[PDB]
Every structure is written in C-alpha cells, then in structure tokens.
C-alpha cells in the first residue's frame, strides 16, 4: 500500500513549479519527507529561492506530512510492528530482544579482532532474508572507510542460510570513502539510490576512523566535533526518512589517567559526547577465549545492561559451540 515515502514529484500536483522541484532535487531533497523535515534556513540557503517561495514549499510539505500531537498509544502501536534484523546468533538475538532495530542508530565499539566487521557482514547478508525468517526484505548498502570489504564472507553466510550467492552479491551496493568530506557527500547519493528502491540496512565502517587523522591536534577539535555532529544528524535524517537500519562502527582509546583503579578495562570509545548523545544503541565488544567474544549493552533507552556470548564461525557470527 502507501507505506513507502512519497516522491518529490508529488509537489507538482500541489502547486509547486517544476523549476523549484528540480532545484530541490539538485540540493538533495529527493523526498517530500526530506523537505518537510528541513528548517526554513536550509531552504533559504538554496540559491534562487525567495522567502515567500520557501514559506509556500514548507506549508505545502506540511500539508501532506503529519507534524502535530499524537497519543502515546498510537506510537506504541506503530512501534509494535517494527522490523528487527537478526544478527545470526541466538544469544545476541535474545540480548537485543529481536536484533538491530530499524529507524534508529546502533554503534558497536571495541578493540581489534573483536568482530565488528564480521557482524556488519552478517547483518548485510541477513537483511535480504524474508521477514518471517528474521530478515528485513531489502537491499543492503556498505559505505567502507577502511578497505576491508570481503565478498567471501557474504557468500559463506549465503551458503549457510540457503540463499543464492549470486543474487546476494547482486543485492548489495558498495561504496568507499577516502576522506571525511567524501564520507559526508556519499549520503546524498545514498538517498538518491534509496528513493527508487527499498533498502533495509545502511552500514558505516567505520564512522570515526578518518576523523582521527583528518583533524589532528587540540586546536582542530571544535571543527572535527562539528563535522561529526553534522554527519550524525544527516544519518538520523536518513533513518527517519527511509526507515532503514543504520549501523556504524567505532574505535577505542586507552585511559592513561589511571583513575580506573580496580577496573581492569581502561578502554573508552572515541568521538566524545557528540557520538555518545547522538547514538541510540551502543554495544561493547570484548574478547573471551578462542573464537568466542562477549557483547555488552553499553547504552540503550529500553534494554538493560547485560552480557552475551557469540562465536565467529566459518559461516559468520553465530552461537558458540560448547
């Protein structure tokens, strides 16, 4: 039915001239939701648009999109049927009470070899599964900032789940980011491709890898944090627009302060308060023994702190073999 977002061409029948629609499409507003969710300042920033034109565009967008008050019962009912993507492991599924949620932001962090890329690959494969089997029934997008994309893992998980490897590879889009500016600019193209086809997942691995070296020194801290906040706000806008599940990867830094005392885990995620507040769900990954690792819910508004065990088998992330 009318579940998908309304395309920008809907503004033609509402009294908006085609030239303004083309200008908005050039600016990146490919959907009625995108223009409806933007402040008047952003529309004014577009060259060739007057105050009256921006006011008319905002009013017309608000006509077709609900923006008022609603009871909590309606929100609870709407959240009841949300789609949760399976991670492939029963223990991690039970820890998150279904898996990674759509329309929100999930960030996993830990030291090296924890298995963040493995979980990203498994989620990318499983997001194409049918809804009744824990999937999201949609394509996958992979924005990679480290050059660590391996189709072999995708084929292995597809073989495990009985899917066809060729179709699984055909239904995944890949892009590489070489700097922070390109990383931010890729999201406009992401929206462009996501308008015409249904996507369920969007992976950034890793969000803060490039910011460590792009902005070096304490004197450049403010600009780095502002750029990171802008990127996270754009990610949230995409998630609220297309309802996709956004998963981002984060690194760690050791606490040289020495005030941890008996706490023998002096690792804290990088990014700071900006990424601490912006992220909705946060996972802490630690190494156990052999090929088994432990995941702990660091930050979540509805999930209590706990710990789960998962093993990186030859078919991806899954349940540990006792």
């Amino acid at each position: 039915e009318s579940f998908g977002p309304q395309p920008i061409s809907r503004l033609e029948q509402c009294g908006i001239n085609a030239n303004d629609v083309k200008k908005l499409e050039e600016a990146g507003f490919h959907t009625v939701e995108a223009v409806a969710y933007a402040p008047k300042k952003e529309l004014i920033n577009i060259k060739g648009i007057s105050e009256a034109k921006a006011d008319k565009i905002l009013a017309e967008a608000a006509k077709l999109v609900p923006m008022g008050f609603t009871t909590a019962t309606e929100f609870h009912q709407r959240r009841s049927e949300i789609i949760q993507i399976t991670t492939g492991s029963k223990e991690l599924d039970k820890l998150l009470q279904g898996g990674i949620e759509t329309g929100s932001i999930t960030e996993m962090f830990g030291e090296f070899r924890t298995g963040k890329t493995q979980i990203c690959h498994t989620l990318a494969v499983t997001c194409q599964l049918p809804i009744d089997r824990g999937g999201g029934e949609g394509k996958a997008m992979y924005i990679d900032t480290e050059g660590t994309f391996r189709p072999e893992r995708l084929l292995a998980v597809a073989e495990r789940y009985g899917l066809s490897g060729s179709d699984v590879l055909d239904n995944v889009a890949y892009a590489r980011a070489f700097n922070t500016d390109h990383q931010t600019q890729l999201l406009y193209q992401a929206s462009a491709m996501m308008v015409e086809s249904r996507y369920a997942l969007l992976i950034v691995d890793s969000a803060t890898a490039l910011y460590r070296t792009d902005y070096s020194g304490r004197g450049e801290l403010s600009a780095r944090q502002m750029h990171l906040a802008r990127f996270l706000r754009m990610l949230l806008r995409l998630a609220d627009e297309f309802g996709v599940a956004v998963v981002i990867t984060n690194q760690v830094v050791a606490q040289v302060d020495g005030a941890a005392m008996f706490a023998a885990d002096p690792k804290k995620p990088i990014g700071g308060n900006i990424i601490a507040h912006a992220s909705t769900t946060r996972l802490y990954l630690r190494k156990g023994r052999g090929e088994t690792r432990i995941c702990k819910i660091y930050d979540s508004p509805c999930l209590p702190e706990a710990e789960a065990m998962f093993a990186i088998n030859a078919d991806g992330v899954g349940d540990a073999k006792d």
Binding site: E1, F75, E81, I82, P130, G138, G243
Partner: peptide
C-alpha cells in the same frame, strides 16, 4: 497515520523467489 519504521504487515515483493 505516523510511520516509525518498516512494517511487518506491509506487503513487500520478495527479492529471492
């Protein structure tokens, strides 16, 4: 009606027939 995420009850064409 407001939308919060992908709907389980929604009719979506399967990608792997």
């Amino acid at each position: 009606s407001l939308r919060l995420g992908l709907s389980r009850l929604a009719r979506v064409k399967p990608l792997h027939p």
